[model samples]
Target: GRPEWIWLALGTALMGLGTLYFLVKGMGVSDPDAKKFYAITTLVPAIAFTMYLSMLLGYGLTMVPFGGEQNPIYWARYADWLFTTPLLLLDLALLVDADQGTILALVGADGIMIGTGLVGALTKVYSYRFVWWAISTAAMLYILYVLFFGFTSKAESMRPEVASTFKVLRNVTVVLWSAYPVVWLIGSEGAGIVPLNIETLLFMVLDVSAKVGFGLILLRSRAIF
Candidate 1:
């Protein structure tokens, strides 16, 4: 419907406005909690609109599933419902009338978890195997939770097309974001006062060997499966 397009246009405008606000103010107009909520809420719709606009410009034809079979309006609505509803609800739950103290507490806890994890991983004072195992286990549990509790819940249902698009987008986001922490961990040996230069050298050698040597062998043998 026209209203759906109107919302899309409004969303696009809001994105531009947000960018301008960032550029001019050099700080977020909203409080930290509201900024976090807004950033998360905007991501999916921005992705969806970019995909749609690309298709319109003959760039994302492969991404457009229905073609002549279904109305574009249906697809637009599907994208809106898939991306917007949950984000709106999440923002409401996390940000609306949220106290600064509560926001600070949550942020502080997150900071502690990340800082402790990084320090533990780098020191080798902690068991490397245990740390790796814990991270992997937590990732697996998160995937399971999302698959079962998120996808199966009525509150999270979406059209098949939207689901497929979202799955691809989600995977891309995860892979890109996951690379940073992995690289940081691999590079951490070079980062401290009593730097483990030998260990750092060994890490770089192993990284190259894995990426170039082992990678080539695996590719040549078609052993990816």
Candidate 2:
């Protein structure tokens, strides 16, 4: 019954519990902005683990298509991302010293990715699903561009001491984010090359790395948390 989900659930709990370590430390900072930023950092993994725990328990330790491959629904997962990904962009933008307008645009694209993916997941029509996937992919392209190209110049613009940390965080995010669409394509909603359990395990690995690993970089870095 317990397979990948144990990691998903336990990883989530460990990360969630770990975030508290930062949150309390965040509040103790003399710099008000650091205080605020680290507090926000806690939310990044919170959205992930909360929904992971929810799905872990809600669907049963062993959920059948107890639903359907035809339906291919993961409303909990989709909804978790819907809210969390934007906060992530916000942190990346801040770390890279990106412009406010630029950050907002990236967040908008992130919204488009999560929003469209949710619709695509719920819709049964193959044609419509592909359309939403295309739209989401387009949004993801902009996001990738922002993460890679857009952040390159912006990272250089940061304070000399902070720029190095920014570079590492920026590059790492690109690697972390690149995993999602690959999994999405092969999983239930796309070509169906991978089974649900495998797809979920893959997603958890990515989520843990992207969300928690990302937070670690900031928490330990000279850059803003």
* lDDT for each candidate structure: 0.36, 0.74
Colliding residue pairs in candidate 2:
none
Q: Top TM-score: which candidate number?
A: 2
- By lDDT, who's the top model here? 2
Mark the regions of model 2 whose C-alpha exceeds 4 Å error after superposition. 1-4, 59-72
Name the lDDT value of residue 6 in candidate 2: 70
Error of 1 at 152 (Å): 7.3
TM-score of each: 0.30, 0.88
* lDDT tens readout by residue for model 2, 1-225: 645567667766866876776677676578765765686678877777678877777552222141234433456777778887888788777776678899889888898899998777766666677788889989988998877888877778778757787777777777877778778778877778897778877887787777777788777876673
Scanning candidate 1 in windows of ten residues, the lowest lDDT window is 64-73
